[PDB]
């Protein structure tokens, strides 16, 4: 098998050869077994919203042409998309809610393993929300902030403040005029599920406006999740680490944190340091915590924990034979890990009541007992390391250097070395003079349909040569880090002269003797909210709305319902938004036209659906350059 | 075409012949055009929860055997079912929320068309919730009740009170021990959507326990909806009216209220009386308001408005040519009505922001302007009546007599004529002595897959001959009313001797000179909560839990996601629950076994999946008789 048709990651290719030798089925094998996939589902022309279904509609030809209840193709496609947006929002609802409850418990004395680590961020959030700080104890300000977070999940006398207080007033006014501001996060999720149920909303424009509103409930949960995680665990600052399977160490207890929530992984990191002698008594050098997916990004950004792998290739970390434990909370975990564990020795451990996998070991993890729960979990890992005394392992000797930790606060601080009292101005100056053509955010998943990382790297290379400032989160950041895009040594090879000049000027002012890295890692998927904060701050400084800025987004290999919600709120806040896999919309030309064209007249953003990455890069550059022209700039 | 293969309703058959002559496509034609339907969807073996899909699994044979991410058949089936339960709960969330906001506005002086009509019910609800009434103004008690209703949608320091205060403590304890009490209505909906999204919950038992909990959030919304509608519009008492298409009148302005919420239909009823002279000036005898679906049930139960038709046959009311307006809010409205209106003359009017249909006229309906909005709507209806001056219409001369209005309060009052201070005892006495074998609730929809009404009438006939007390709601009540099961003149033909003796004794004590009807109509689908209140009161009076009572439920022709949620909470509160159409579970034997067997060990209820109605009746009788035996009674 030509493994570069499956992944462009050479460590993943090596593990794919090992999996094939050993007869271990992978995600790529399960994909091949699924082909050809159902074209009704691929196009969006299938509905199972009642027990008269399944209903399908032929994309072309003869009957069936309409659902049994009379639902048209437009209605069926829009309802399916809306449910995907609601499901993404629900994942960020649970994540943010988790952190809100943890902060509340911490300041009520009920969870002593947690505390206010970033007091400055706590006070700035309180100020943004309108919560008074003068004369108040930190623990009382934090209680108020946690209560406000919980209140945004339901209707109240204000709209969702993690929308209205984080976008410029001009953008809030545009959205309010179209009825798009969410009333409550879980309120919107429930209204979507209602209006898309049988015999309810059946007008594509009305349905899609509901979808835009629910996508802003997802943005709110992301921004809430970042705000709360920064309070509890610290705002990221620049860090240096490594990525790819070579960060595993045959002689250590290798423990992957995988899933999403730092409430769990951050404690694993600190406890693992305390249990080092306990690990050495078992014959290991220590506990080697490594990251997979977003929770790996969280501990990479805050602590420099090296990233082992991401998304589609997560099983490969197990195939090395050296992964002693995989510690899970929720989201983006292939349930195949539980069965592969049987073959690879790995102990897969779930920790959250609503996210169990048959055949995994479950260790309930309560914030009230976090340290005790973490020691129980890590002792299972040490037990597993001892069982592989004497077995060979195959860890590919492949890793990259990763400079990361570029929270919005960190970026503003780095820029402030060039202009202390007007930190955004050096960035804007270089946009205006052409040294920075625009900004592109790469975000979202890998997807087995796309050779892993190929779209992220192909599009990133073309944009960097054209002097685009590239930022990245989630498994987009994972794709770019595993291919060297976060190593400043690659600036000369990857970047246009103008962008290199800017990256070098900023880095030298930060005492680096070298540039910032080619791509700025802004964190996890909830940390797409950080990109929003940066873009909104640039909008505010310029006095224009986000739909006038030369800023675009690319979910180049999207997979999860969260990525659909992300793409939709990127459009709703005003960005040209590329998606590099087909969402289930092509069976309705009216819906496609709304999402790629007429929504421009509502929010100023729009989707760019393009599966060829070189063409996608051209289209993203055209969108950036159209925004430049609209500001009167050369391009 | 043999129209009795489509519907057992003879008025519907006549309209099917008219539709065929005129070339108007119906729901049955769209069903035929859909056959054969997709077997992956029929069995539940399809997943579209991420953009790597669609994934399918062959029920038998070779690959594909597992989803791309590793999701097994058990996980895929359970996740799809859970989303259907969440969607049903969301429909009842929106309905109940609507009423809560209306009550709040009414007592805040913001909606003068609405008021506290049932002060006794207001005070009993407040007492059940723990809200003090002594020394308080009604408007303040009502504000507190509305605030408590809204609070149950989100997490707080108590669980959902419209669950914990409406079931016996012993049942609440059983549910709490299994972690099944909902924390908040919209909270549970969002948690379902999260845990069923890609890479989250992947254990069938864990997923299904989440589904049971979310089904109790649906029960809460139903019970909240009934409680609030009774406060605002009056608790039903016995009423006499008629049903079927013959209630339309060629010489009147015929206006159907269709959908769910009495906030709209109840005002239509009162305003239509005030506009009678305005209608006579246009040449009509008056405005003839008729009911379709649940909102028709609501105004039938409270005002005796005749029911025109239900569920699957709703288009047929338009085919008569005499339907001048169809006034819609949300749920169970076939969107085909908007296109059929073009051919039939009918003015289809939507009124709710989240439920529009392309091609219908939209008239926003604000509770603050209810009377003004209703007059605008009814004036469109009068305009339409005038346009059919001189056209022939074909109204089948087919109707039945319907005695209805059996709220739980009404049933208790009727029984109190036999035992004033212990009203449930005469019912229990007749259960014990065999005159009443048990109780069966028929509920839920019609479904185009089943000849309309055939399962409801076939099963009801067999149970009535075996002396089962039969109660009904929703389109189950609609099916039974359109076939004469709500006419006391049919008691001798339909009922066993024991049941006839009881129905006659109760009716004679109520001054009727005749029995109660063969089937007691307990109202709309939210009014399945009334059946809960009756059964819980019987449990309390006997000192046993609901899973010991000889009470069963039958969703004999289920369709909507709401009906899946209903069947699941009937199981969760302890009832043997028949479903007469295949839910998408047969592709997983483990899930089927949980839902039909091992859940007995958790909640004491269980599903009975049986598509043959004579066999279903036997199985329901066996379940009733097993409960009789468990109480030591003859059967
Ligand atoms: S909602 Fe309409 S289109 Fe969807 S399954 Fe039911 S009948 Fe078919
Ligand atoms: S969640 Fe798993 S099973 Fe479902 S579509 Fe995605 S890959 Fe397939
Ligand atoms: S027909 Fe294949 S996704 Fe439904
Ligand atoms: S394959 Fe037909 S419902 Fe998906
Ligand atoms: Fe993620
Ligand atoms: Fe209904």
UniProtKB/Swiss-Prot annotation, chains A, B:
<keyword id="KW-0963">Cytoplasm</keyword>
<dbReference type="InterPro" id="IPR016101">
    <property type="entry name" value="CO_DH_a-bundle"/>
</dbReference>
<keyword id="KW-0479">Metal-binding</keyword>
<feature type="binding site">
    <location>
        <position position="38"/>
    </location>
    <ligand>
        <name>[4Fe-4S] cluster 1</name>
    </ligand>
</feature>
<dbReference type="GO" id="GO:0051539">
    <property type="term" value="F:4 iron, 4 sulfur cluster binding"/>
</dbReference>
<dbReference type="InterPro" id="IPR004137">
    <property type="entry name" value="HCP/CODH"/>
</dbReference>
<keyword id="KW-0472">Membrane</keyword>
<feature type="binding site">
    <location>
        <position position="47"/>
    </location>
    <ligand>
        <name>[4Fe-4S] cluster 2</name>
    </ligand>
</feature>
<comment type="similarity">
    <text>Belongs to the Ni-containing carbon monoxide dehydrogenase family.</text>
</comment>
<feature type="binding site">
    <location>
        <position position="475"/>
    </location>
    <ligand>
        <name>[Ni-4Fe-5S] cluster</name>
    </ligand>
</feature>
<dbReference type="InterPro" id="IPR016099">
    <property type="entry name" value="Prismane-like_a/b-sand"/>
</dbReference>
<comment type="function">
    <text>CODH oxidizes carbon monoxide coupled, via CooF, to the reduction of a hydrogen cation by a hydrogenase (possibly CooH).</text>
</comment>
<dbReference type="InterPro" id="IPR010047">
    <property type="entry name" value="CODH"/>
</dbReference>
<feature type="binding site">
    <location>
        <position position="445"/>
    </location>
    <ligand>
        <name>[Ni-4Fe-5S] cluster</name>
    </ligand>
</feature>
<keyword id="KW-0533">Nickel</keyword>
<feature type="binding site">
    <location>
        <position position="46"/>
    </location>
    <ligand>
        <name>[4Fe-4S] cluster 1</name>
    </ligand>
</feature>
<feature type="binding site">
    <location>
        <position position="55"/>
    </location>
    <ligand>
        <name>[4Fe-4S] cluster 2</name>
    </ligand>
</feature>
<feature type="binding site">
    <location>
        <position position="525"/>
    </location>
    <ligand>
        <name>[Ni-4Fe-5S] cluster</name>
    </ligand>
</feature>
<dbReference type="GO" id="GO:0016151">
    <property type="term" value="F:nickel cation binding"/>
</dbReference>
<keyword id="KW-1003">Cell membrane</keyword>
<dbReference type="GO" id="GO:0004601">
    <property type="term" value="F:peroxidase activity"/>
</dbReference>
<dbReference type="Pfam" id="PF03063">
    <property type="entry name" value="Prismane"/>
</dbReference>
<feature type="binding site">
    <location>
        <position position="260"/>
    </location>
    <ligand>
        <name>[Ni-4Fe-5S] cluster</name>
    </ligand>
</feature>
<dbReference type="GO" id="GO:0042542">
    <property type="term" value="P:response to hydrogen peroxide"/>
</dbReference>
<dbReference type="GO" id="GO:0043885">
    <property type="term" value="F:anaerobic carbon-monoxide dehydrogenase activity"/>
</dbReference>
<feature type="binding site">
    <location>
        <position position="332"/>
    </location>
    <ligand>
        <name>[Ni-4Fe-5S] cluster</name>
    </ligand>
</feature>
<protein>
    <recommendedName>
        <fullName>Carbon monoxide dehydrogenase 2</fullName>
        <ecNumber>1.2.7.4</ecNumber>
    </recommendedName>
</protein>
<keyword id="KW-0411">Iron-sulfur</keyword>
<dbReference type="InterPro" id="IPR011254">
    <property type="entry name" value="Prismane-like_sf"/>
</dbReference>
<dbReference type="GO" id="GO:0005737">
    <property type="term" value="C:cytoplasm"/>
</dbReference>
<feature type="binding site">
    <location>
        <position position="69"/>
    </location>
    <ligand>
        <name>[4Fe-4S] cluster 2</name>
    </ligand>
</feature>
<dbReference type="GO" id="GO:0006091">
    <property type="term" value="P:generation of precursor metabolites and energy"/>
</dbReference>
<dbReference type="GO" id="GO:0005886">
    <property type="term" value="C:plasma membrane"/>
</dbReference>
<keyword id="KW-0408">Iron</keyword>
<comment type="subunit">
    <text>Homodimer.</text>
</comment>
<keyword id="KW-0004">4Fe-4S</keyword>
<feature type="binding site">
    <location>
        <position position="50"/>
    </location>
    <ligand>
        <name>[4Fe-4S] cluster 2</name>
    </ligand>
</feature>
<dbReference type="GO" id="GO:0050418">
    <property type="term" value="F:hydroxylamine reductase activity"/>
</dbReference>
<feature type="binding site">
    <location>
        <position position="294"/>
    </location>
    <ligand>
        <name>[Ni-4Fe-5S] cluster</name>
    </ligand>
</feature>
<keyword id="KW-0560">Oxidoreductase</keyword>
């Amino acid at each position: 098998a030509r493994q570069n048709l499956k992944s462009t990651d050479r460590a993943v290719q090596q593990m794919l050869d090992k999996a094939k030798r050993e007869g271990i089925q992978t995600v790529w094998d399960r994909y091949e077994a699924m082909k050809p996939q159902c074209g009704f589902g691929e196009t969006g022309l299938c509905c199972r919203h009642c027990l008269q279904g399944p209903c399908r509609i032929n994309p072309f030809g003869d009957e069936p042409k309409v659902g049994i209840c009379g639902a048209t193709a437009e209605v069926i496609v829009a309802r399916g998309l809306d449910r995907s947006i609601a499901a993404g929002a629900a994942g960020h609802s649970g994540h943010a809610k988790h952190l809100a409850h943890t902060l509340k418990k911490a300041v009520q004395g009920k969870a002593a393993s947690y505390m206010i680590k970033d007091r400055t961020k706590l006070h700035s959030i309180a100020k943004r929300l309108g919560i008074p700080t003068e004369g108040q104890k930190d623990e009382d300000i934090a209680l108020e902030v946690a209560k406000a977070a919980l209140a945004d999940f339901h209707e109240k006398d204000t709209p969702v403040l993690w929308v209205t207080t984080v976008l410029p007033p001009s953008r809030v006014k545009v959205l309010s005029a179209h009825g798009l501001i969410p009333a409550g996060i879980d309120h919107e999720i429930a209204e979507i599920m209602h209006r898309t149920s049988m015999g309810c909303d059946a007008d594509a424009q009305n349905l899609l406006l509901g979808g835009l509103r629910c996508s802003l409930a997802d943005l709110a949960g992301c921004y809430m999740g970042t705000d709360l995680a920064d309070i509890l665990f610290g705002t990221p600052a620049p860090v240096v680490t490594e990525s790819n399977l070579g960060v595993l160490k045959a002689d250590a207890v290798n423990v992957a944190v995988h899933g999403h929530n730092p409430v769990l992984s951050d404690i694993i990191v600190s406890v693992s340091k305390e249990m080092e002698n306990e690990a050495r008594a078992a014959g290991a050098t220590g506990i080697n915590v490594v990251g997979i997916c977003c929770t790996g990004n969280e501990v990479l950004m805050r602590h420099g924990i090296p990233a082992c792998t991401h998304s589609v290739s997560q099983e490969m970390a197990m195939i090395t034979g050296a992964l002693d434990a995989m510690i899970l909370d929720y989201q983006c975990i292939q349930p195949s890990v539980a069965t592969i564990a049987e073959c690879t020795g790995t102990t897969v451990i779930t920790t959250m009541e609503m996210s169990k996998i048959t055949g995994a070991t479950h260790v309930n993890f309560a914030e009230e007992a976090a340290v005790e729960n973490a020691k129980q979990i890590l002792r299972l890992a040490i037990d597993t390391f001892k069982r592989r005394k004497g077995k060979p392992v195959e860890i590919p000797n492949i890793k990259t250097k990763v400079v990361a930790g570029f929270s919005t606060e960190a970026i503003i601080n780095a820029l402030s070395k060039l202009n202390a009292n007007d930190p955004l101005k050096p960035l804007i100056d270089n946009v205006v003079n052409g040294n920075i053509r625009g900004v592109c955010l790469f975000a979202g998943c890998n997807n087995v349909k796309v050779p892993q990382d190929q779209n992220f790297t192909t599009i990133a290379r073309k944009l960097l040569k054209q002097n685009v400032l590239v930022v990245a989160t989630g498994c987009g950041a994972g794709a770019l880090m595993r291919h060297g895009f976060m190593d400043p040594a690659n600036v000369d090879e990857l970047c246009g002269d103008g962008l290199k000049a800017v990256l070098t000027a900023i880095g030298e002012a930060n005492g680096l003797g070298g540039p910032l890295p080619p791509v700025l890692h802004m964190g996890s998927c909830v940390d797409n909210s950080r990109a929003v904060a940066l873009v909104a701050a640039l909008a505010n400084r310029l006095g224009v709305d986000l739909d006038r800025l030369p800023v675009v987004a690319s979910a180049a290999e999207a997979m999860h319902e969260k990525a659909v919600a992300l793409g939709t709120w990127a459009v709703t806040i005003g960005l040209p938004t590329h998606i590099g896999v087909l969402p289930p919309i092509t069976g309705s030309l009216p819906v496609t036209q709304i999402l790629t064209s007429s929504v421009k007249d509502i929010t100023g953003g729009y989707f760019i659906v393009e599966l060829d990455p070189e063409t996608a890069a051209d289209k993203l550059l055209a969108a950036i350059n159209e925004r430049r022209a609209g500001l009167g700039l050369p391009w």
